[PDB]
Amino acid sequence: RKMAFPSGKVEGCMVQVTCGTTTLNGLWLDDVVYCPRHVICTSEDMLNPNYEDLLIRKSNHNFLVQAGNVQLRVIGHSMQNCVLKLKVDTANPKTPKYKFVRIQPGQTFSVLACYNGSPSGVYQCAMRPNFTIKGSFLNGSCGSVGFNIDYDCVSFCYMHHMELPTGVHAGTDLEGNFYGPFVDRQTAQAAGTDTTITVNVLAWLYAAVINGDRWFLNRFTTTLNDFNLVAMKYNYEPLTQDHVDILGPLSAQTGIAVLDMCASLKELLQNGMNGRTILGSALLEDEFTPFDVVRQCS
């Protein structure tokens, strides 16, 4: 199952940011609030905004930042790519240890879905190879963030900005750089065709082996290049060197070399399951990373 990180350290950072009647969520860390820059847009400006021009018209006193009903005074503002940074006069006492990270496709993270600065729910998301996520976002959710927690430290990796015609979602890292080819404009935009996250399918096969479900292990191996060329014909992602390395721990735990598992997967792609199941499913799961597999099995 999809297991999220405990959300409390992030709940303690959520605020709301309002310009006129446009309200979205912001992230309050130390004395800075981060939020999507389109908070400065009127509904009519979103159709195609000139962000630099809209911002020059704004002053600190135009931004309403609230933690609950308590206003936080803004003392400076700047735009960094597609995010606004609002300097406020109070350092957030609940600021966790944190960092800003830019994740790769296939990586998973927890989303704390928020409305009006109030958290509604937490769930696990995977960044697709086409740089969309299958979120559960409604109007007012922008500025909700995605994150991982490692020991004491919250790694923020996603801030929510928009929905695409197909129902999937797009956003930025906390430096305001979109994942994928998207722009924060209320225009119709299409994601590239999606593909299957090979490194996560391999993680899932390793998980199956750990649990004693290993009928699919074959006697063969392959080169990485040969595997990548075959996998693309089945709309699977090619593997990177980094993928091979993050499978290291599971390969060590099972004694199954990464390239042997690749050969087992190739046979499943070429011959199908033949009516068999793996971990109680005829479908190969691609939204559990190698870290997720280790998280849940211990």
Ligand X SMILES: *[C@@H](O)[C@H](C[C@@H]1CCNC1=O)NC(=O)[C@H](CC(C)C)NC(=O)OC[C@H]1C[C@@H]2CCC[C@@H](C2)C1
Catalytic residues: 38, 142
Q: What is the dihedral of CA 95, 97, 100, 104, to 10 degrees?
A: -130
Tell the smallest beta-carbon distance from residue 64 to a second copy (Å): 23
Q: How far apart are CA 160 and CA 35, in angstroms?
A: 9
Q: DSSP states of 10-67 as a string?
A: HHTTEEEEEETTEEEEEEEETTEEEEEGGGG--TTGGGS--HHHHHHT--GGG-EEEE
Rounded to the nearest 5 degrees, what angle is found at the Cα of 36, between the Cα atoms of 34 and 37?
Answer: 105
Which of 75, 91, 138, 229 is the binder for ligand Y4D (CB under 6 A)? 138
Q: Cβ of residue 12: shortest distance to a second copy, in angstroms?
A: 7
Q: Taking contact as CB under 6 A, which single stretch among the options 60-68, 121-129, 180-188, 197-205 is the one that binds ligand Y4D?
A: 180-188
Start-to-end Cα distance in the chain = 14
Q: Report the alpha-carbon distance of residue 164 to residue 190 in Å, rounded.
A: 7
**Closest approach of ligand X to the CB of residue 185, in Å:** 6
Among 21, 59, 69, 139, binds ligand Y4D (CB under 6 A): 139
Choose the one of ligand X, ligand Y4D, a second copy, none that binds residue 20, judging by a C-beta under 5 to 8 angstroms depending on kind.
none
| Angle CA 156–158–162, to nearest 5 | 155
Q: What are phi and psi of 243, to 5 degrees?
A: -60, -45
Please report whether residue 186 would count as binding ligand Y4D according to CB under 6 A.
yes
Cβ atoms of 106 and 83 within 8 Å: the answer is no
- 186 binds ligand X per the rule CB under 6 A: yes
Listed residue (265, 207, 205) closest to 234, CA to CA: 265
List the single partner that 103 binds among ligand Y4D, a second copy, ligand X, none, CB under 5 to 8 Å by kind.
Answer: none
Taking CB within 5 to 8 Å according to partner kind, which of ligand X, ligand Y4D, a second copy, none is near residue 9?
A: a second copy
Tokens of 48: 């195609």
Closest to a second copy by CB, 13 vs 262, is 13
Taking CB within 5 to 8 Å according to partner kind, which of ligand Y4D, ligand X, a second copy, none is near residue 217?
Answer: none
Restricting to residues 38-67, name those near ligand Y4D by CB under 6 A.
38, 41, 46
Q: Does 128 bind ligand X (CB under 6 A)?
A: no
In whole angstroms, the minimum distance from the beta carbon of 118 to ligand Y4D comes to: 15
Contact residues toward ligand Y4D (CB under 6 A) are 24, 38, 41, 46, 137-139, 141-142, 161-163, 169, 184-186
Residues contributing to the site for ligand X (CB under 6 A): 24, 38, 41, 46, 137-139, 141-142, 161-163, 165, 169, 184-188
